[PDB]
From a paper:
The chloroplast envelope Quinone Oxidoreductase Homolog (ceQORH; At4g13010; molecular weight 34,034 Da) from Arabidopsis thaliana is associated to the inner membrane of the chloroplast envelope where it represents 1–2% of the crude envelope proteins. Despite its original annotation as a “QOR,” ceQORH is inactive on quinones but preferentially reduces γ-ketols in the presence of NADPH. γ-ketols are long-chain reactive electrophile oxylipins and are potentially toxic. The ceQORH monomer is formed of two domains with (i) the catalytic domain including residues from Gly3 to Pro132 and from Leu277 to Pro329 and (ii) the cofactor binding domain (Val133 to Leu276) showing the classical motif of Rossmann fold. In the ceQORH structure, the internal chloroplast targeting sequence is folded as a two anti-parallel β-strands (Thr71 to Gly81 and Asp91 to Leu97) connected by a long loop (Ser82 to Gly90).
In the crystals of the binary and ternary complexes ceQORH-13-KOTE and ceQORH-NADP+-13-KOTE, the asymmetric unit contains 12 and 8 ceQORH molecules, respectively. The quality of the electron density map for 13-KOTE differs depending on the monomers in the binary and ternary complexes, suggesting flexibility of the 13-KOTE aliphatic chain. The 13-KOTE binding site is large and solvent accessible. Upon 13-KOTE binding, the loop from Leu97 to Gly103 moves, thus stabilizing the ligand. In the complexes ceQORH-13-KOTE and ceQORH-NADP+-13-KOTE complexes, residues of three ceQORH monomers interact with 13-KOTE by hydrogen bonds and van der Waals interactions. The 13-KOTE carboxylate group from one monomer is hydrogen bonded to the Arg58 guanidinium group and Tyr14 hydroxyl group from another monomer. Thus, the 13-KOTE carboxylate group is an anchoring point allowing for oligomerization in the crystals. When the apo-ceQORH structure is compared either to the ceQORH-13-KOTE or ceQORH-NADP+-13-KOTE structure, the main chain from Asn46 to Leu61 and from Ile250 to Lys269, containing the α-helix Pro254-Met267 involved in the dimer interface, are shifted. 13-KOTE is not a substrate of ceQORH though it displays an unsaturated double bond in α,β of a carbonyl group. The tetramers observed in the crystals do not have any physiological significance.
Residue numbers in the entry: 4 to 329
Write the structure that this text describes.
Amino acid sequence: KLMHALQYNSYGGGAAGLEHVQVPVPTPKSNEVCLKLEATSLNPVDWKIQKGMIRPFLPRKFPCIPATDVAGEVVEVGSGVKNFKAGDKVVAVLSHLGGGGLAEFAVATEKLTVKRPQEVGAAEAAALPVAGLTALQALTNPAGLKLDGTGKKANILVTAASGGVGHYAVQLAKLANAHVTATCGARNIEFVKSLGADEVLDYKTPEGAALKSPSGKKYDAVVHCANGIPFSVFEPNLSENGKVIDITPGPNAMWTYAVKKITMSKKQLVPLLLIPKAENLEFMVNLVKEGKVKTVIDSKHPLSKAEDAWAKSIDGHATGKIIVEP
């Protein structure tokens, strides 16, 4: 019947603007499944939407229940659901239109729900969807690396590699047999080395502010997860046809993309929008199961204290992924 959740009913609230509320448990449609949530993961998008930065596209209507990355147990399925039964443990991606993550229950489409193996925890799994698939898409599509053994070997730069997409990106890039150069805060330099990065740079230094690799590497692709960097700084560090992949693209990135396209610049800036596909989520889940990829969890917060997790996300000093559990 009813359900604990967190809502914002207005732009600009910050964590203060979140409200604990009791709300009717959603009902699954033909193709949806209903989950008792075991873990929910935050993404920077989630608090940006609330700040109003994604207007006029999101949020669709107030009030909003935030977060899309989710793991839990199937409680109930819709008439059309073929592949999941009640009791099944899953990981899923909620619609970016309706949100729903910060709650006891959520409905997910079957096409974005994946069975979660016994080996993989709920928090470990819930951290995967947006961050992991983004990292995966960037390295698979624009960077053009296979992740078996048949991919192009290459030089990869990962900016802000201590964060959500960042720390997945480094691990994945290593599985594609790439040389990985990474940037992060001084504190996280040892951590990023442990993800498999070949070179790690303190971004406040001179070689890291300029993104110059000690081997003198030029990068074939950049999984760009940081924010304050103009194409100027990337350019001299790029290979002849290097692509900087902005996984959090603003108007600046969008414009640069247009200009570099229309002037046929050999060096390119690629805005990335994630297209979550269940095959990829299944894939990432397997990588975690097989130990080829580890999820690092910055912190775990109870839904009753979810604003803390929200504020931690807003500060964005998180290392890996922030998790909210019941």
